[PDB]
Amino acid sequence: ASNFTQFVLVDNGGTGDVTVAPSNFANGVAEWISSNSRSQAYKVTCSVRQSSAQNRKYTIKVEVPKVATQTVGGVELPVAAWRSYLNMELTIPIFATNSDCELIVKAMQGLLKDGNPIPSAIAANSGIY
Amino acid sequence: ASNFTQFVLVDNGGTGDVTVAPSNFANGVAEWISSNSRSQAYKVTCSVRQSSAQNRKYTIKVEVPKVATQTVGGVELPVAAWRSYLNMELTIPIFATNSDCELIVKAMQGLLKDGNPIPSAIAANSGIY
Amino acid sequence: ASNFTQFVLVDNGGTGDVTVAPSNFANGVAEWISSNSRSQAYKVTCSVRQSSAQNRKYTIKVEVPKVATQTVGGVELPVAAWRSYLNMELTIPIFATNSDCELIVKAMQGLLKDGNPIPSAIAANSGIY
Amino acid sequence: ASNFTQFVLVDNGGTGDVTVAPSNFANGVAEWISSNSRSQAYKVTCSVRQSSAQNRKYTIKVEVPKVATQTVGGVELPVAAWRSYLNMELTIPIFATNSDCELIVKAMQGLLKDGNPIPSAIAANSGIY
Amino acid sequence: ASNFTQFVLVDNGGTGDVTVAPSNFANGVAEWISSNSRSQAYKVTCSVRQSSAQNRKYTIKVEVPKVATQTVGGVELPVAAWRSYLNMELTIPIFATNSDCELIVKAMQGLLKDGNPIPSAIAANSGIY
Amino acid sequence: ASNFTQFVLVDNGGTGDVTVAPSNFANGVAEWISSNSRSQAYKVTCSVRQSSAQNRKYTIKVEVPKVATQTVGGVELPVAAWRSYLNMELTIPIFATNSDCELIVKAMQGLLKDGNPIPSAIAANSGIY
RNA sequence: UGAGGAUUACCCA
RNA sequence: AUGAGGAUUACCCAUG
RNA sequence: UGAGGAUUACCCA
RNA sequence: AUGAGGAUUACCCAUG
C-alpha cells in the first residue's frame, strides 16, 4: 500500500470537486490540505496510537471553510465565524480483525449517508425532532 | 417531517443489514438502537447545543458491538465480547448558511468513501503512510 | 417518528373516551394530560433509567380524577373531588431481547384483562376471597 | 364464590398460554404461581389494605422469568436466568363507588393497550421519543 | 392533533411570506426556524410547564432578524445589532377551561391587531403619547 | 395623533366584545382597563425604555380575569375568581428601521393567528407535539 | 414520600 | 474552553 | 428494599 | 444583564 495520497473530499460531480493533497507528516500525523490559504483551506489530519493496553485509537480532524460570502484570498476575521471543525475519535479493541474493522467503516458510512437523519439535520441547521 | 426515523447503519446489501431505530429522546439526546437485547445492541446517539454565543455543536456517538454468548454461573447470557466507540463533535459557526452546512456533510461523506485513505487505513489495521 | 403522542386512556365506546395528549418532556419524564381544566384532568407520566448495571427501570404514573365543582363563598371552581393514584415500576435486565419484552407486555395485559381476578377485585371495591 | 382462582397471565393464542394457579393466601397476600419448577415459574401477588383513613391501597407484583438451564459441575438444574419485576400500587379513596372503580380499571387497561405509547416503548427496549 | 407543524410567521400576501418549520424538540421545547443561517433566521420556541400548584406557564420566544441592509449569508457583527428578541410568558391557572383558554388567545390576538395602539407604537419606533 | 386610544381587546364579534380604554400614564407606564370595577377589570400596560445604549425594550402586560361574585362577611362583592397573566418583553436594536419594526409586528401577529401551532396548543390545554 | 436499590411482600433516605 | 488525554463511553482526567 | 404514607416524579424507615 | 426562575403580577428570587 501507501495510502498517503490525494483524494476528493467534496464530490460535486466532477465540476468544482474539492481535492485535498498530502501536505505534512510531522510526527506520524498525516495532513492533507486543499489548494488555498490556510485560513480558507479544507484540512484533514489523521493519526493512530494505542490508547491503552486494550485499545487502538484513530483521531481524525476536519476543518471546513464557510464559503457563502467568502472573499477568496482575503483576510476574514474572526477566524471562528468562518470555519467549522470536525473531530472524530474511533476506539477499536485490539481483538478486532480486518473484518471487524471493515464493518466499523460501514457503520460510519451508513451514519453519514445521504437522506439519513444525522446528515439531514446538519445540512438543515437543525437538531432532531 | 420528523427527522427522527430509522435508518440502516450497516448496509450489508439487503441481507444482514443493521438497521437502527428511534428509542429515546430523554434529556435532549436522540438515541437509536438495533433490535437486540440492550446488552448486544448497536447504538447511535446525537445531540446539538449552542455551545457558545456563535457556535452550535453536534455530539454524535456510535457503538458497534462484537456479540457473543457468555456462560456466567452455568447460565448463558447474550453479551458483547467488546465494543468499538466512535465519538464525534462538529462545531459550526452560527453564520453558516444551509449550503455551507451541506458542504460539511459532503466533506464527511467523501472522507469515508471506499477507497479513500482513511477508510482504507482503518479497515486494514494500519496507519497512514 | 414518535411514541410521544396522544392516545385513548379510557375507551368508552367511541364517545366519552378519555384522550390524553403530550404536554411536557422535561428531565426524562414524559407527561400526558387530558383536555380542559388541568384541575380535572387525567395525567400519565413515564420515564426510563438504567437502575443498575444490569437493569433498566420504567416508572409509570396515572391519576384518575373524580370531577366535581367546588363552591366557596359563592365562587365555583372546577376541581377534582379526589384522585386515585397508580404507580408502577418495571425492572427489565439488559439481557432481555425484543421477544422477552413483548412477553413482559403480554403478562401485564393479561393481569388486567376483564374477568381475571385482579381487575375484578378492583372494579368492585374488593380484595381477594 | 371466589376470585382466588387460576387465570391466564400470558395469552399465546390458545397454546403456549401461561396460566397462573392459586398457591397461598397467608397474611392478606394472595399468591398465584405457574406450574412446573417453582424456580422457573411466573408469580403474581396481590393484597389490599386501608392505607389511611380515606384510602384503600392495592399492591400487585408480577415476576416474568427467563427460563434457562444451569449447568454446574455437570449437574444441571432448571433455573430462571433472570427475572423482570413489576410492582404496582393503586390508591382508591373510600368515596369511590363501583362505577368509579370500573373507570379506574379501564384507565389501566387503556394505558397498556397494544399500540399505545407505553406498551410500545417497553416491548421494544425503548423509552419515550 | 399534532400541532408541531410548519406555519407562516410573516404573511406578505403570498409573495415572500416567511415560513418557519420544526427544527428541534430537545427536552420538550419545540423549535421552528426559517430557512437561513442561524444568525439570520426567524426562530420560534415554545414550552409549557406547571409553574406551581395553581398555574401552568407557557414560555414562547421569538427572534426576528434586522433585514434592512442585511447581507444574506454574511457574517454580521455585533449579533445584538442585528436581532430583535421577543419573550412571552403566559400564566394560566389550573381552573381555566378550554373556553377560558380560547378567550385568552383572543385577548392576545386583539392586543396585536393591526391599527391598535401597541402594534402601531412598535412599528413606528415609538412609545405611547 | 396620540396612539393612546381605546381598542377592543377581545373581539367577540360585535356582541360582548371586551374593549379597553386609556386609564393612566403615571410613571411612564401606559395603562388601559375595561369598564369594570377595578377588582374585575381586564388590564393592559405598556412601557418602553432604552434598556441599553443600543436597545430599546418594550414591556407589555395583559391581565384576563375570571369574574365572580363572592360572599364575604354575608355581603356580596364583585370579584375575580382568578387571573391569567401575559408578560411580554421585546428588545429591539436601535439600528432597526421602521420596516424592520413592521416585520417584528407581523411575526407576532402570525405567531398567534388562528390555526397556527401555538394558539392551538394553548386553547386546548395542550403542549406542542 | 422518593423517575430511591434490590437476590423482589426486602432493603435505603 | 483546549488536549493525536483515558474509558467500562451522554463518563473521567488535566490545563485554562 | 419496604402488602411504608402521601396533597403523588414527594415525603419516611 | 441572564433564567423553559416564582408571583398574590410595574413585584420577588438567583446568578453575573
Curated annotation (Swiss-Prot), chains A, B, C, D, E, F:
Signal peptide: none
A molecular function (GO) term: identical protein binding
GO cellular component terms given for this protein: T=3 icosahedral viral capsid
Keyword RNA-binding in record: yes
InterPro entries: Levivir_coat, Phage_RNA-type_capsid
Subcellular location per the Swiss-Prot or TrEMBL entry: Virion
Transmembrane segments: none
Region of interest (Viral RNA-binding), ranges: 31-104
Keywords: Capsid protein, RNA-binding, T=3 icosahedral capsid protein, Translation regulation, Virion
Domain of life, source organism: Viruses
GO terms of biological process kind: negative regulation of viral translation; regulation of translation
Role noted for this protein: Capsid protein self-assembles to form an icosahedral capsid with a T=3 symmetry, about 26 nm in diameter, and consisting of 89 capsid proteins dimers (178 capsid proteins). Involved in viral genome encapsidation through the interaction between a capsid protein dimer and the multiple packaging signals present in the RNA genome. The capsid also contains 1 copy of the A2 maturation protein. Acts as a translational repressor of viral replicase synthesis late in infection. This latter function is the result of capsid protein interaction with an RNA hairpin which contains the replicase ribosome-binding site.
Family under the similarity heading: Belongs to the Leviviricetes capsid protein family.
Oligomer and partners: Homodimer. The capsid proteins form dimers that assemble by group of 5. Twelve such pentamers are linked together with free dimers. The homodimers binds to the viral RNA via an operator hairpin, but also to many other RNA sequences in the viral genome; this interaction probably shifts the virus from the replicative to the assembly phase and ensures specific encapsidation of the viral genome.
The protein's name in its UniProt record: Capsid protein
Organism: Escherichia phage MS2
Classification lineage: Viruses, Riboviria, Orthornavirae, Lenarviricota, Leviviricetes
